[PDB]
Design a protein around this ligand. Structure first.
Ligand SMILES: Nc1ncnc2c1ncn2[C@@H]1O[C@H](COP(=O)(O)OP(=O)(O)OP(=O)(O)O)[C@@H](O)[C@H]1O
Ligand SMILES: Nc1ncnc2c1ncn2[C@@H]1O[C@H](COP(=O)(O)OP(=O)(O)O)[C@@H](O)[C@H]1O
Ligand SMILES: Nc1ncnc2c1ncn2[C@@H]1O[C@H](COP(=O)(O)OP(=O)(O)O)[C@@H](O)[C@H]1O
Ligand SMILES: [Mg+2]
Lengths: 465, 1411, 80
């Protein structure tokens, strides 16, 4: 058991160190024990491996894709370094060293000796990075939990999912509730009315047993430390109360939540990123709920914007090679651009040529407002050049051509026609280089960097213990 | 509340309210009455607005009621004056007519509306060219009207110029467009001011379009504010602000400070007829005031801007941020009433909130999450320069403003790409704003041309370039634009400059004339000047020379104030306000302004005032006066004023580096970079010689002087010295100073040595005379180049000198001396003659005792020669090398000079210097120098500052205490820190000692200070002179045991061998406290004497053991571990065997030789068993009488008790114990003190102890030691030293025998009085004030005993104790750091002395202890 | 603070019935019924070397090493 015991500390020490780095990455000793208890319900060897599997399956969910992968690589080195040969240890460390830029050399080749490990070197040598990074997860042979699975296993009434500003799992939670156990109640924390209504709907829902969500807690935080800190601590009767589940939404990049509260509540990182085309379809999708307020020609501009926004946001992710730094573009930025679009049609003639100042205003005030680096400001602009000026056929992306309103001038026809152009397109394999004008070479450079980050942080973590 | 109450109270009067309006309006300053009626109002700017209806005022009227009518009429009055004017210009009336009768706000709005409408139609026709010239004419028309204008209306024309230039600029851009589409894009981005001639509600009739969006002009008065020059970037800010506001979103711009984000919010308000309220956030700003202000804004429907929102405290910021959301959420929805600060207040929908966000330490600050969805963030950027250049050129009087702006930018841009990367180089727009600002006065001389641009370029750009880049300038200036061949003011200034220098001593070199010219041309335009260069560049010469040359050329007198910036505190210099009585006291920089501003009783109006800051300049100091450096030209008090500075009043800055200062500070001022020293090596010496000759003229006849100057001229030529100064560099220089700055040291010495033998020059042979000169010149030239050298280097340099001087001329020897008869004339040069010293047994240790050597006399002579020159001396060298002794003995011998020792520590204040001096110096108001600080007696005073490279430096890194001495050496007096005037010190000299700056603890000193010093490196001597020296020391003490007179030399040789070995075996490579010096030898020599003078008749076996014990206590007590401790046991053995071969020795280990005077009446070797038993009978007693503490008496402890005993017995007893923890170092000290009959003082310090408290604890123990004759033992622990100052006080108590600060002023007089009481009581009168304090000090030195207990010397705080030289040198260091295995077993045995246990297998007790 | 210091080191000034201790200045009577304990929260904060040596340092912290001990109890409940 000492042999089991020694491993579990270095495991917990690793999970602990993630909490030092980032606030949301806490782990408690009881979390670790509850996890280790699960492992039961050469025997010592199997139980050990049952731990490393179980630890991966439970604590993976509460980390982001980077930390998922650092935990995988580290855990693999914590296990296979002790168990496997010293021949093994330097071969895998030499490979982690190529993935980081620490060193580059070729490991021990032994025919039939190691094939799993011979298969990794193939990934690293083929310069295929993301696959090499995942190899450490796969090597654990675990069926990796969905937020859903987590929720089903969990019997806690509280949950906090942090997420990057790129997304909001608000809509994941909607389909999670609808598919089983219904009872979805979205509560925005805005002003005093919202907080005031909020705390009312909280106390009532727990007795009723409905699901509740507290959208974007970070913003309302001063209140959290006063009301929620007391309230969630007091509510050990919430365990006694009807099957009910409360959810809270954070942002990782942003104001730091209290650790005690955070540890009480289950944790997930919504890491789930939509396609360019899918976001086009999600954007265009809602715009029909308005009714009909604007003319046929506008619908075209609104479709254009739907593409534009879905292209800049996709480009946001890929830095450095893409934008210089991480910029976040919102639904608010879409709204202000559409507002100006309705207005430029309301103030101008139905001649198509108003297009020049549509570019400038969208690229320098509406979206270029936040942008501070001149390098990036030209990117926004060159994209407006492409999305906004164009005659009759645009070809926003290589597959798809966007044709200008027809003489028939039907707005219901045009919706159907522009929805049809979306349904016909299939977003290619290489979308991030083919659709966002940027070259493939740059995409790989990005892939290489995120590899480098996981491999570095693991080297560092191994030496530290 | 306060101001509100005054208004309601003052209602009867009405007139009193005008003061408060300025606050609740922002635009207006005071209200105008006929008393019955309000005729109008005036703005803070000066502009007079008259109302349409003058409001009548009566007893039965409320302030509420009358003021509310005023607000309404004031806006209506604006519409009136607007339509009145707009209609006029519609009927083609010239703008010059309108200006005189319409308020700016009204005429501005009218121009905008008419312009916009005239350009709107011009887009249809495309008749741009014809409207353009038309406007261009109005531009010139307004420009010439400005020159003929009353200053108040001069603001109005200038403000309108901002606008009319913008007008023509837009039309011009429109003229240029490729197509009509291109023109209609450009036009959409502009702010278009329209009118409704269709509907009523006239205050709602004027509206503004931009980017497709409209914004209704609210009518509110703005006055005539200085209008922001229109840039594309400006319009874009205006464009975002309108796009945010249209959707009911708040505007927010983040960016670097100095981008004018608030200026923009201000401007954008004004353009729409609003006075935007700016909340400067976090400037001691209450939340309750802002919560007030917020409600006021939501009711009045005003515009609020949070100027640098980021700088608010988390508590405040949450509260504010939450409030703002309510408002922005209320507007977005349009809720009539919204709740904020838990009150239902109504919200005007005219309301808007703006947040400027300056960057923090990380980068650009952020909005709280709630505000992110409520505001719209924008990135302010500095404007591309080209655009601002053109406009600024256009306002001043254009010529071709388009091409000058191209050309200026290209040039500045080209400089950046072509010049070297230098730290102080700025070719940023700040620089072109400066070149442009410099242009205005320059136009007055020449034209509104490129040639005036050209001259401004070379006025600002050139003085800051360094020689390589100085041609890059000339090459690209002529490449871009070639303007003029010759300069005006070429002859007239120059002759006024040369005549000033001939009088000053100076030589007109290519460079000195250049840098003199560059300066002259700068003072003209620039009010603040910066002079940067290598220390001794000639900067104080250039400016003092130009300044002087202007009183000859203009005829205007100068009044110069040189202030060392960093010697004084910001409070001492700018203005200090005192906590409780909040009394405003002047300071230094503000008080000298009051002579010019407050009381120009004499001529200050016709005079020029110049305020020079010699010292290194830092942000904190320049920031406190940034307002004078601003366009303001006014000084801002911390509380209670702005004081205006005239154009007479110039600020200079001379410094050596700029690394600390801000590019912002530079570009307000004019920078004069001194690339090289102004003048030739020869030319410096030339001036220097003549300056030296002048000193002598007041103590030497013309016949003597004429003849001595004839000698100097023919003895040394430049060709010789050239190679000597070249070779000076090929040498290793400790405390290095550059060759050029060595010259004052040379010539001053040379002149003094020659003027010394002046009587012997009357009759002496003309061949022989030359040789006397040449020898002294060769000598003085040696110490001035090679004095700070190894002397191993000096010897080699002596030949280098001989080489390059003429071959026949008298050669220099290592110990060369000149010899002359006392009463009868003789000549010849013979060397190295030494007196023989006899001193008795008691004389062996004496604070004033030096054994003359080949080197002692050599050093004492040169050191003394420098004082006669009156040059500052810096003695550098390792500890124990004799800097202190050589200095002290050369001066304790002479009647001329009188010495005062100041011992410097890590943190010494400049007042410490002054307090120490106040006993020996006397202020007298003699007319010769106003206040003077001469010495309190008639003959010269010498301040010896020991450890001058020890005091620390500002966070920027500048040691003020050093700069204070630099002030004394260069300026000759100093500014009084409290009373605030100049005191010129009379006949006081600076001499300092310091360790090499490669040594740890040591701080590097400023070449600006060390340039004034002759530097002498003194090392250790021989290992063979040391042996000679201490032989005479043993000789003296062996007058007590004459039977061993044979044995004095082998004892002296042994002592030195042990020294040599300890120093080599145990160095600072093993432990930091392994630091040995001849001080230890002198401690050993005396330590032997003391045992003899109070011991039984000594056998040869006794004496060697007596010597061995002292050798142990002086060299090995400090040694750590056992490997080194055993090493010394064998070393001691090894040394006796080589020098004193005997068979009578015993075990020489410290444990076996125990010497004490506790049992014996004499200091004798005692028995191990006799001592242990004596301690045991005394420890019971000490246990019972004092603190009850059980301990085991063991072998080590007895040895240690004797260590402390000898320490506490010596007259000056300082011992520091290093004991880890639990060793009992603190208990043993208390015990040995109690045995010796010493009062045990242990500072009762605690968490809540101030310095004053510890000051008290010290002061008492000091006063009880002299006035009560206490014989106290002061135990200071590492815990006791709470601040750094505590330890600094402890130093002063050791290095000197008193703390001067404790007893100063009145507390000095009280002590002085009490002292005379006790002095008389004991039976002596002491005549002088100095004679009494010298007893007081001498009493402390023999009654006060400081014992230090530090546990881990590895700790950084306990490191500082050991580090401190004062403590380390004047203490006996002892090591108790670990328990020995033998002492562990010994202690364990006595503890298991009680026997519960019974026989066992195996001893039973012996086994348990071993586990 | 330094003053408690004599109370920590067992130093006292004896009388027939009364036992006195010096704190700051005032000499106060020690009961015998009197007990002293010192409490701290953070091992990050360093206590002075004088105290640390006379004081009985005890760590009431649930450590990482706590997991080692607690996993064997959990393993053996599910193993034997
Ligand atoms: N034209 C000249 N001919 C001869 N000597 C000159 C000339 N100009 C300057 N010097 C020498 O240079 C020195 C000028 O000292 P000054 O105080 O101007 O230098 P500094 O850089 O201000 O030094 P610090 O910065 O230490 O005050 C004078 O002592 C003088 O001997
Ligand atoms: N030539 C000498 N004559 C007399 N004493 C000397 C001589 N050389 C060294 N010493 C001894 O060394 C000590 C000199 O130390 P000091 O000059 O104070 O050190 P430093 O000047 O390096 O601070 C004196 O106590 C003195 O006894
Ligand atoms: N010789 C000894 N016999 C018994 N106890 C000792 C001895 N030396 C030190 N101690 C113990 O170690 C502690 C140190 O006492 P102290 O004299 O203050 O030394 P320090 O100043 O190093 O703490 C005491 O509390 C004492 O109990
Ligand atoms: Mg000077």
């Amino acid at each position: 058991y000492s042999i089991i015991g020694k491993h579990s500390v270095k495991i917990f020490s690793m999970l602990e160190k993630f909490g030092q780095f980032h606030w949301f990455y806490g782990i408690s000793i009881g979390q670790f024990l509850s996890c280790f208890k699960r492992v039961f319900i050469t025997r010592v060897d199997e139980i050990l491996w049952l731990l490393y599997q179980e630890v991966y399956c439970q604590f993976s969910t509460a980390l982001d894709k980077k930390f998922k992968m650092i935990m995988a690589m580290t855990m693999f080195c914590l296990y296979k370094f002790d168990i496997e040969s010293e021949q093994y240890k330097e071969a895998v460390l030499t490979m982690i060293g190529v993935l980081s830029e620490s060193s580059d050399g070729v490991p021990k080749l032994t025919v039939d000796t190691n094939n799993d490990l011979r298969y990794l070197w193939d990934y690293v040598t083929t310069k295929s990075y993301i696959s090499a990074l995942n190899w450490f997860k796969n090597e654990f042979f675990v069926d990796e939990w969905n937020i859903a699975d987590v929720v089903a296993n969990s019997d806690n009434n509280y949950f906090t999912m942090a997420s990057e500003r790129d997304v909001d799992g608000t809509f994941k939670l909607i389909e999670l509730a609808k598919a089983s156990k219904e009872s979805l109640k979205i509560i925005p924390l805005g002003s005093i009315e919202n907080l005031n209504y909020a705390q009312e709907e909280i106390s009532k829902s727990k007795i009723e047993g409905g699901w509740i969500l507290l959208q974007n807690i970070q913003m309302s935080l001063s209140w959290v430390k006063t009301y929620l800190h007391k309230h969630v601590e007091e509510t050990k009767a919430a365990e006694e109360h009807e099957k009910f589940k409360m959810f809270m939404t954070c942002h990782l990049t942003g104001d730091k939540l209290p650790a005690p509260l955070l540890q009480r509540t289950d944790r997930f990182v919504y890491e789930d990123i939509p396609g360019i085309l899918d976001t086009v379809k999600d954007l265009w999708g809602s715009q029909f709920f308005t009714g009909k307020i604007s003319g046929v020609w506008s619908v075209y501009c609104t479709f254009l914007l739907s593409w534009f926004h879905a292209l800049i946001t996709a480009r946001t992710r890929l830095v450095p090679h893409g934008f210089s730094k991480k910029y976040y573009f919102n639904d608010c930025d879409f709204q202000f651009a559409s507002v100006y679009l309705e207005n430029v049609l309301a103030t101008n003639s139905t001649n198509n040529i108003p297009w020049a100042q549509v570019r400038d205003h969208i690229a320098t005030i509406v979206y270029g407002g936040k942008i501070d680096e001149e390098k990036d400001l030209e990117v926004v602009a060159k994209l407006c050049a492409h999305v906004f000026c164009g005659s009759d056929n645009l070809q926003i992306v290589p597959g798809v051509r966007i044709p200008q309103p027809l003489l028939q001038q039907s707005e219901e026809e045009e919706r159907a026609r522009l929805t049809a152009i979306l349904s016909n397109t299939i977003e290619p394999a290489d979308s991030l280089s083919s659709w966002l004008q940027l070259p493939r070479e740059s995409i790989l450079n990005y892939e290489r960097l995120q590899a480098k980050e996981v491999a570095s942080s693991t080297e560092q973590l191994l030496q530290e213990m | 509340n306060d101001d509100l109450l005054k208004i309601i109270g003052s209602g009867k009067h009405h007139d009193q309210v005008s003061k408060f309006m300025k606050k609740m309006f922002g635009s207006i300053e005071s209200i105008i009455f006929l008393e019955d009626f309000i005729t109008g109002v005036r703005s803070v700017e000066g502009e007079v607005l008259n109302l349409n209806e003058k409001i009548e005022l009566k007893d039965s009227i409320q302030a509420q009621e009358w003021l509310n009518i005023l607000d309404t009429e004031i806006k209506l009055s604006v519409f009136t004056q607007f339509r009145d004017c707009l209609g006029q210009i519609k009927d083609g009336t010239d703008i010059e007519v309108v200006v005189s009768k319409y308020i700016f706000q009204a005429i501005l709005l009218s121009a905008q509306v008419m312009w916009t409408e005239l350009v709107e139609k011009c887009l249809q026709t495309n008749q741009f060219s014809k409207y353009w010239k038309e406007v261009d004419m109005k531009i010139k028309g307004l420009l010439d009207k400005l020159n003929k204008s009353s200053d108040n209306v001069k603001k109005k024309i200038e403000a309108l110029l901002v606008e009319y230039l913008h007008f023509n600029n837009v039309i011009g851009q429109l003229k240029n467009c490729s197509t009509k589409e291109e023109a209609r894009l450009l036009w959409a981005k502009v702010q278009k001011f329209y009118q409704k001639n269709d509907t009523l509600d006239d205050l709602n009739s004027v509206f503004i379009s931009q980017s497709g969006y409209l914004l209704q002009y609210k009518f509110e008065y703005i006055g005539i504010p200085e209008r922001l020059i229109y840039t594309p970037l400006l319009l874009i800010g205006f464009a975002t602000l309108t796009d945010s506001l249209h959707q009911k979103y708040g505007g927010c711009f983040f960016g670097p400070a100095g981008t004018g984000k608030t200026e923009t919010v201000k401007a954008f308000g004004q353009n729409l007829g609003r006075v935007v309220v700016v909340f400067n956030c976090d400037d001691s700003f209450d939340y309750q005031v802002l919560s007030r202000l917020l409600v006021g804004i939501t009711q009045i429907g005003a515009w609020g801007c949070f100027d640098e929102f980021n700088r608010l405290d988390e508590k405040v910021l949450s509260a504010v941020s939450a409030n703002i959301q309510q408002i922005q959420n209320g507007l977005q929805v349009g809720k009539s009433h919204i709740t904020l600060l838990e009150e239902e207040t109504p919200l005007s929908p005219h309301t808007a909130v703006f947040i400027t966000l300056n960057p923090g330490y990380n980068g650009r600050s952020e909005l709280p999450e709630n505000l992110k969805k409520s505001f719209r963030e924008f990135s302010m950027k500095s404007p591309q320069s080209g655009t601002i250049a053109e406009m600024i050129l256009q306002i001043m009087g254009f010529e071709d403003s388009k091409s000058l702006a191209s050309k200026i930018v290209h040039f500045l841009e080209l400089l950046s790409s072509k010049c070297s990367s230098m730290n102080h180089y700025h070719f940023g727009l700040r620089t072109l704003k400066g070149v442009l600002r410099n242009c205005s006065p320059l136009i007055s001389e020449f034209g509104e041309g490129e040639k005036t641009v050209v001259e401004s370029l070379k006025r600002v750009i050139l003085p800051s370039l360094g020689d390589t880049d100085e041609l890059v300038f000339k090459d690209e200036l002529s490449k871009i634009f070639d303007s003029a061949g010759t300069p005006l003011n070429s002859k007239a200034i120059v002759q006024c400059l040369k005549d000033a220098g001939q009088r000053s001593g100076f030589s007109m070199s290519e460079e000195f004339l250049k840098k003199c010219m560059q300066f002259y041309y700068m003072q003209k335009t620039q009010q603040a000047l910066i002079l940067v260069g290598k220390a001794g560049c000639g900067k104080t010469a250039t400016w003092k020379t130009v300044i002087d040359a202007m009183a000859i050329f203009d005829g205007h007198a100068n009044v110069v104030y040189v202030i060392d910036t960093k010697v004084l505190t910001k409070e001492s210099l700018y203005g200090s306000m005192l906590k409780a009585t909040l009394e405003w006291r002047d300071g230094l920089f503000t008080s000298i302004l009051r002579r010019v501003n407050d009381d120009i009783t004499g001529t200050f109006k016709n005079s020029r005032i110049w305020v020079v800051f010699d010292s290194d300049l830092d942000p904190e100091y320049v920031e406190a006066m940034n307002s004078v450096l601003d366009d303001n030209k006014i000084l801002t008090l911390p509380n209670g004023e702005r004081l205006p500075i005239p154009p007479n009043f110039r600020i200079l800055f001379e410094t050596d580096n700029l690394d600390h200062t801000t590019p912002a500070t530079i570009t307000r001022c004019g920078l004069l970079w001194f690339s090289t020293d102004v003048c030739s090596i020869s030319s410096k010496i030339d001036h220097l010689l003549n300056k030296s000759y002048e000193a002598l003229d007041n103590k030497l006849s013309m016949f003597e002087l004429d003849k001595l100057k004839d000698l100097i001229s023919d003895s040394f030529d430049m060709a010789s010295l050239t190679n000597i100064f070249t070779c000076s560099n090929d040498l290793v220089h400790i405390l290095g100073v550059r060759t050029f700055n060595k010259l004052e040291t040379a010539v001053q010495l040379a002149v003094h040595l020659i003027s010394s033998y002046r009587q012997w020059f009357q009759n002496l042979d003309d061949k022989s005379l030359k040789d006397v000169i040449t020898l002294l010149i060769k000598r003085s030239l040696l110490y001035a180049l090679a004095g700070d050298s190894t002397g191993e280097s000096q010897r080699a340099f002596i030949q280098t000198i001989n080489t390059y001087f003429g071959h026949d001329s008298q050669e220099l020897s290592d110990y060369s001396t000149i010899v002359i008869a006392n009463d009868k004339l003789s000549f010849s040069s013979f060397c190295s003659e030494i007196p023989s010293v006899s001193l008795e047994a008691h004389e062996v240790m004496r604070p004033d005792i030096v054994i003359p050597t080949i080197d002692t006399i050599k050093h004492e002579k040169i050191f003394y020669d420098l004082l006669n020159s009156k040059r500052g001396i810096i003695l550098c060298g390792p500890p124990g090398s004799g800097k202190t002794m050589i200095m002290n003995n050369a001066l304790r011998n002479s009647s001329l000079y009188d010495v005062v020792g100041i011992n410097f520590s890590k943190d010494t204040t400049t007042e410490h210097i002054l307090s120490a001096l106040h006993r020996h110096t006397n202020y007298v108001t003699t007319s010769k120098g106003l206040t003077l600080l001469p010495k309190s007696d008639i003959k010269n005073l010498v301040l010896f500052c020991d450890e001058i490279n020890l005091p620390k430096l500002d966070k920027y890194g500048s040691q003020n205490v050093v700069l204070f001495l630099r002030q004394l050496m260069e300026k000759q007096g100093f500014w009084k820190t409290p009373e605030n005037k100049w005191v010129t010190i009379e006949r006081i000299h600076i001499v300092g000692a310091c360790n090499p700056p490669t040594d740890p603890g040591r701080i590097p000193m400023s070449e600006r200070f060390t340039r004034h010093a002759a530097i002498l490196y003194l090392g250790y001597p021989s290992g063979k002179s040391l042996s000679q020296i201490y032989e005479i020391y043993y000789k003296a003490i062996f007058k007590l045991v004459p039977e061993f007179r044979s044995y004095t030399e082998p004892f002296a040789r042994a002592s030195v061998h042990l020294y040599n070995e300890c120093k080599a075996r145990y160095s600072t490579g093993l432990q930091s406290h392994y630091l040995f010096s001849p001080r230890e030898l002198t401690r050993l020599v005396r330590g032997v004497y003391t045992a003899i003078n109070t011991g039984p008749r000594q056998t040869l076996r006794s004496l060697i053991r007596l010597w061995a014990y002292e050798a142990w206590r002086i060299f090995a007590d400090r040694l750590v571990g056992v490997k080194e401790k055993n090493s010394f046991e064998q070393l001691l053995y090894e040394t006796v065997d080589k020098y004193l071969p005997n068979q009578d020795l015993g075990n020489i280990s410290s444990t076996s030789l125990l010497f004490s005077g506790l049992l014996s009446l004499d200091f004798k070797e005692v028995n191990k068993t006799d001592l242990v038993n004596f301690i045991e009978e005394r420890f019971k007693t000490f246990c019972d009488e004092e603190l009850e503490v059980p301990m085991v008496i063991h072998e080590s402890m007895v040895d240690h008790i004797l260590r402390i005993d000898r320490a506490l017995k010596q007259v000056q007893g300082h011992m520091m114990l290093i004991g880890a923890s639990r060793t009992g170092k603190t208990i043993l000290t208390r015990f040995v003190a109690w045995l010796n009959g010493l009062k045990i003082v242990q500072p009762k310090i605690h968490r809540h102890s101030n310095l004053s408290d510890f000051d008290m604890i010290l002061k008492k123990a000091i006063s009880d030691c002299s006035l009560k004759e206490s014989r106290t033992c002061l135990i200071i622990d590492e815990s006791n030293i709470l601040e750094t100052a505590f330890l600094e006080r402890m130093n002063t108590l050791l290095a000197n025998a008193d703390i001067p600060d404790l007893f100063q002023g009145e507390e000095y007089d009280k002590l002085l009085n009490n002292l005379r009481n006790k002095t008389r009581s004991l039976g002596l009168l002491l005549d002088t004030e100095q004679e009494l304090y010298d007893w007081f000090v001498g009493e402390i030195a023999k009654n006060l005993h400081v014992v230090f207990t530090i546990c881990d010397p590895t700790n950084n705080k306990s490191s500082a104790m050991i580090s401190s030289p004062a403590l380390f040198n004047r203490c006996i260091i002892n090591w108790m750091g670990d328990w020995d295995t033998k002492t562990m077993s010994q202690v364990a045995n006595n503890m298991v002395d009680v026997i519960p246990m019974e026989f066992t297998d195996f001893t039973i007790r012996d086994a348990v202890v071993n586990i | 603070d330094p003053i408690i210091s004599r109370l920590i080191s067992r130093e006292f000034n004896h009388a027939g019935n009364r036992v006195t201790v010096e704190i700051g200045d005032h000499e106060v009577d020690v009961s015998g019924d009197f007990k002293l304990f010192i409490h701290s929260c953070d091992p990050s904060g360093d206590i002075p070397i004088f105290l640390r040596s006379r004081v009985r340092l005890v760590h009431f912290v649930t450590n990482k090493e706590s997991i080692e001990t607690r996993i064997f109890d959990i393993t053996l409940t599910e193993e034997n």
